[PDB]
């Protein structure tokens, strides 16, 4: 349906929020987390409605599983502010599990809780959340140290085998998010990466992302300022 749809650009603010939430659940299933998180967050501010009250719990519940997959691990504070902490509460445990990066904790917690999760629309995603936990463990092992033995890592994350650690590490490098080398024969992971953001072409990229979020904010502030006066101008005042 979505491929055939066209949303008007002159639709009102409630209409946009409802549309965006609903679209957000759909792209998240496809493997597009990046646009899915942004659409869900913006809907809540866009329209504070009395309709909106029924929606909010779902939006946050779905949103958190959706973030973990993108590759951000959300902080504690976010749970605290909307005072809906309790609704968020079973989710909060899944979060503490990713920051530690240990596999074993994730599977148990997610299962008992899983029954509740089915409701939001999370079930399809739920399986994939397994892989994020380890991905966070791999990033910490490579980044922190140079060489630590493969056996030390196997125990820490609670993988099934020392062998299992090799295969997972080997895949992660190809994706290129880790930026390390695993030496299979030598019995260790070597850190090829070094922590930097001024070295390569990259300080420019660092500026690029910072500037990029801004271009949208600027366009909105300026247009919005003009907007009550546009109606006064039409009402015939100079």
């Amino acid at each position: 349906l979505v491929s055939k749809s066209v949303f008007p650009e002159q639709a009102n603010n409630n209409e946009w929020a409802r549309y965006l939430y609903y679209t957000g659940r759909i792209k998240a299933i496809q493997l597009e987390y990046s646009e899915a998180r942004r659409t869900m967050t913006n809907a809540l501010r866009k329209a504070p409605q009395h309709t909106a009250v029924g929606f909010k719990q779902t939006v946050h519940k779905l949103l958190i599983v959706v973030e973990l997959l993108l590759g951000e691990i959300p902080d504690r504070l976010q749970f605290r502010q909307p005072s809906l902490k309790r609704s968020l509460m079973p989710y909060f445990l899944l979060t503490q599990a990713v920051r530690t990066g240990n596999l074993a904790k994730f599977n148990q917690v997610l299962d008992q809780f899983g029954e509740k999760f089915q409701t939001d629309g999370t079930y399809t995603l739920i399986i994939r959340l397994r892989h994020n936990v380890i991905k966070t463990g791999v990033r910490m092992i490579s980044l922190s140290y140079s060489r630590i033995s493969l056996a030390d890592i196997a125990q820490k994350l609670q993988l099934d085998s020392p062998e299992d650690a090799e295969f997972i590490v080997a895949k992660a490098i190809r994706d290129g998010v880790i930026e390390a080398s695993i030496n299979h024969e030598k019995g260790y992971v070597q850190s090829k990466e070094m922590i930097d953001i001024y070295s390569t072409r990259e300080p420019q990229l660092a500026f690029h992302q910072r500037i990029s979020f801004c271009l949208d904010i600027h366009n909105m502030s300026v247009k919005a300022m003009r907007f009550p006066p546009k109606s006064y101008n039409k009402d015939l005042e100079s």
């Binding site: 902080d75 504690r76 503490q96 920051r99």
Partner: peptide, 24 residues
């Protein structure tokens, strides 16, 4: 993040005493 404070106070005092004996 995670709550490092509860765990560190108990671990730091106890572990350190065994470590004294184990290593320099």
């Amino acid at each position: 993040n995670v709550e490092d404070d509860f765990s560190n106070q108990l671990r730091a005092e106890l572990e350190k005493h065994g470590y004294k004996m184990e290593t320099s």
